[PDB]
Amino acid sequence: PTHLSVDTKFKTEGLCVDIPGIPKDMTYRRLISMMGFKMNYQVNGYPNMFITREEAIRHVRAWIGFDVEGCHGTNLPLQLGFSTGVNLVAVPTPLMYKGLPWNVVRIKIVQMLSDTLKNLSDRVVFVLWAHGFELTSMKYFVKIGPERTCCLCDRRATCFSTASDTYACWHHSIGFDYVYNPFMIDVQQWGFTGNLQSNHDLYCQVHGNAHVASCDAIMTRCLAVHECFVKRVDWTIEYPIIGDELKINAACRKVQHMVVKAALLADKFPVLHDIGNPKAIKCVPQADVEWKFYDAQPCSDKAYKIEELFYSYDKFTDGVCLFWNCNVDRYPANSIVCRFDTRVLSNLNLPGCDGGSLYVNKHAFHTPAFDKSAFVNLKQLPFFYYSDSPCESHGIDYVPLKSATCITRCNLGGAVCRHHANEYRLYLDAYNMMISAGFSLWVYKQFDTYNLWNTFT
Ligand SMILES: COCC(=O)Nc1c(C)cc(C)cc1C
Ligand SMILES: COCC(=O)Nc1c(C)cc(C)cc1C
Ligand SMILES: [Zn+2]
Ligand SMILES: [Zn+2]
Ligand SMILES: [Zn+2]
């Protein structure tokens, strides 16, 4: 059971207002045929246009919500809405475009999907709340057949051009007019009571219903993200590397060791309460401190309430609390915090449910909306580099470093050595990588790097 059987049953009740008289008994095979496509008994990598919830989850980066609303349908104009906020009007002859024939609408669809998806995925998954018009409109912009490769590269073909009779991936599709071998999933097949807006609004207050097709496309995809990543969580699914995943993760580990090490050296807390991932390891193994761990999985729905995390019966007020990606409603004043900023624009961060974002880096993590009020008892952690390692080069040309934030014995002594200058510049690069990936760093108000200078005596 790798792919979705074309002989699987498809519930058609949601389709009968646009398509009156639709048979109750229906398979994906008959549905695809009714959509004007022909599968021709082809065992060439594309067994079905529709996919399972499990395949959809593995391909979350390819998700594009799609809705079609009849403005007046062979005789009537259709409004094509996508979760990118785009609305196109197709004539049979929140960005709104005026009525145009299918031959030009299809060119815009290819361009839009290609720019959105080229750095996210090898495919497109149309996420629907199917009522009929969206399925019957696909024949005007989609072509299907065997799996193919790009004419200019080795990636799989996602587009076709009738002008040159060629196939292309999302990176090489300029001027292509057809979407080739797209995938799709109907959210209505998952068993819901009531319409799209009533199910979406149960969990999300950030997406409204401005009554246009793109609003429904956005609500549709958001509801699918809620079901697959908020209410259901699977950390055993691995996602491919598409960007700076490894550098970002390495940078996070470097910054954590640095910040926690200097907080312990500057304020000498007797105990550190490490709250978060139950698989955490001490980030400063040589530190004197009493290291105590508290297990909390990443919260994917709402931030943890500090009262439920700390109360219900031990002394968190003693020493310092470390919340490394442990999203709480209000941090205590004695904290060291790393909190992901859901508003960050990146190829790793996908739009999520109710202000949250879906951060995909090896695993998918739905993260509650970033809230500046969580950090009221703390301040932003300033950049700094600290090193007690000896000044000794060993073993990439040089320019002398001058910086008030290079906290080393050589800078204290008046002149930064080559070793600490190379290490500072590498650390600053890792730091900038982590911040630009969306991570934010917060610290207890008494934290002062001036206290690190006397750790060299
Ligand atoms: C970060 O979590 C703080 C906290 O309250 N943890 C805790 C729990 C949950 C149960 C018992 C019996 C004891 C403690 C210290
Ligand atoms: C409950 O924690 C109260 C608090 O603010 N603790 C604190 C103290 C007392 C001294 C230093 C230098 C730093 C911290 C974080
Ligand atoms: Zn290509
Ligand atoms: Zn929503
Ligand atoms: Zn040095």
For ligand 1, is residue 294 a contact (CB within 6 Å)? yes
353 annotated to bind ligand: no
Class of residue 314 by CB neighbours under 10 A (exposed 0-12, middle 13-18, buried 19+): exposed
Torsion of CA 348, 354, 355, 361, to 10 degrees: -20
Q: From the CA of 169, which ligand is nearest?
A: 3
**Is 205 in contact with 222 (CB distance < 8 Å)?**
no
Is 4 contained in some domain?
A: no
Closest CA to 231 of 369, 352, 403, 359: 352
Q: Is 115 a catalytic residue?
A: no
Q: From the CA of 385, which ligand is nearest?
A: 5
> 3-class SS at 286?
coil
Q: From the CA of 158, which ligand is nearest?
A: 3
216 and 121 housed in the same domain: yes
Q: Is 448 a catalytic residue?
A: no
For ligand 1, is residue 309 a contact (CB within 6 Å)? yes
Range of the domain at 97: 13-230
Q: Is 13 a catalytic residue?
A: no
188 and 279 housed in the same domain: no
Spell out the alpha helix ranges (H) of 185-344.
196-200, 213-225, 245-267, 306-310
Residue written as tokens 């970002």?
A: 248
Kindly state the DSSP code that residue 151 receives in the 8-state scheme. S
Atom 10 (ligand 2) nearest CA: 446
Task: Give CA–CA dist 10/28, Å, rounded.
Answer: 6
Q: Give CB contacts under 8 A, 24+ apart, made by 379-385.
A: 379/442, 379/443, 379/445, 379/447, 380/440, 380/441, 380/442, 380/443, 381/259, 381/441, 381/442, 381/443, 381/447, 382/449, 383/428, 383/431, 384/262, 384/449, 384/452, 385/258, 385/423, 385/424, 385/427, 385/428
Q: Is 134 a catalytic residue?
A: yes
280 and 330 housed in the same domain: yes
* Token code pair at residue 230: 């908020």
212 and 96 housed in the same domain: yes
Instruction: Say which of 59, 131, 186, 216 is annotated catalytic.
Output: 216
Residue 338, C-beta contacts closer than 8 angstroms, at least 6 positions apart: 252, 255, 256, 323, 324, 325, 439, 440, 441, 442
Atom 6 (ligand 2) nearest CA: 334
- Backbone phi, psi, residue 137, to 5°: -90, -20
For ligand 1, is residue 165 a contact (CB within 6 Å)? no
**Is 190 in contact with 55 (CB distance < 8 Å)?**
no
311 Cα nearest atom in ligand 1: 5
Class of residue 2 by CB neighbours under 10 A (exposed 0-12, middle 13-18, buried 19+): exposed
Q: From the CA of 369, which ligand is nearest?
A: 4
Instruction: Say which of 59, 131, 134, 227 is annotated catalytic.
Output: 134
253 and 214 housed in the same domain: no
Atom 14 (ligand 1) nearest CA: 314
84 and 145 housed in the same domain: yes
The experimental method, as deposited, was X-ray
**The domain boundary residue, chosen from 196, 230, 264:** 230
Q: Is 234 a catalytic residue?
A: no
Closest CA to 123 of 93, 94, 144: 144
294 and 422 housed in the same domain: yes
316 Cα nearest atom in ligand 1: 3
**The domain boundary residue, chosen from 197, 230, 263:** 230
Task: Give CA–CA dist 309/277, Å, rounded.
Answer: 14
> 3-class SS at 304?
strand
For ligand 1, is residue 310 a contact (CB within 6 Å)? yes
310 and 438 housed in the same domain: yes
Task: Centre a 10 Å sphere on the Cβ of residue 157 and count the other Cβ atoms it contains.
Answer: 24
- 159-161 vs 178-180, strand pairing mode: antiparallel
Ligand 5 mean position, distance from CA 392 (Å): 7
Is 437 contained in some domain?
A: yes
445 Cα nearest atom in ligand 2: 15
- 63-70 vs 363-367, strand pairing mode: unpaired
**Is 125 in contact with 62 (CB distance < 8 Å)?**
yes
Is 236 contained in some domain?
A: no
For ligand 1, is residue 314 a contact (CB within 6 Å)? yes
Task: Centre a 10 Å sphere on the Cβ of residue 189 and count the other Cβ atoms it contains.
Answer: 16
Residue written as tokens 């105590």?
A: 292
Is 383 contained in some domain?
A: yes
Is 274 contained in some domain?
A: yes
Spell out the alpha helix ranges (H) of 325-436.
409-412, 418-436
Tell me the structure's resolution in angstroms, rounded to a single decimal: 2.0
Atom 12 (ligand 1) nearest CA: 313
69 annotated to bind ligand: yes
Closest CA to 293 of 308, 278, 313, 305: 278
Kindly state the DSSP code that residue 334 receives in the 8-state scheme. S
Q: How open is the CA angle 339-341-344, to the nearest 5 degrees? A: 150
63 and 208 housed in the same domain: yes
Ligand 2 mean position, distance from CA 378 (Å): 11
Helix axis angle for 245-267 and 418-436, nearest 10°, is 110
Number of domains in the chain: 2
> CA neighbours within 13 Å on the CB side: how many for 51?
23
364 and 403 housed in the same domain: yes
Atom 11 (ligand 1) nearest CA: 313
- Helix (H), strand (E), coil (C) string for the chain: CCCCCCCCECCCHHHCCCCCCCCCCCEHHHHHHHCCCCCCCCCCCCCCCECCHHHHHHCHHHEEEEEEEECCCCCCCEEEEECCCEEEEEECCCEECCCEEHHHHHHHHHHHHHHHHCCCCCCCEEEECCCCHHHHHHHHCEECCCCCECCCCCCECCEEECCCCEEECHHHCCCCCEEECCEEEEHHHHCCCCCHHHHHCCCCCCCCCCCCHHHHHHHHHHHHHHHHHHCCCCCCCCCCCCCCHHHHHHHHHHHHHHHHHHHHHHHCCCEEEEEECCCCCCCCCCCCCEEEEEECCCCCCCCECHHHHHCCCCCCCCCEEEEECCCECCCCCCEEEEEECCCCCCCCEEECCCCCEEEEECEEEEECCCCHHHHCCEEECCCCEECCCCCCCCCCCCCCCCCCCEECHHHHCCCCCHHHHHHHHHHHHHHHHHHHCCEEEEEECCCCHHHHHHHCC
Is 268 contained in some domain?
A: yes
**The domain boundary residue, chosen from 164, 198, 230:** 230
Kindly state the DSSP code that residue 271 receives in the 8-state scheme. E
Residues in the chain: 457
Is 217 contained in some domain?
A: yes
129 and 226 housed in the same domain: yes
Q: Which of 304, 311, 313 to mutate to test the pocket of ligand 1 (most atoms within 8 A of CB)?
A: 313
254 and 225 housed in the same domain: no
Strands (E), 330-438: 335-340, 349-351, 357-361, 363-367, 378-380, 385-386, 406-407
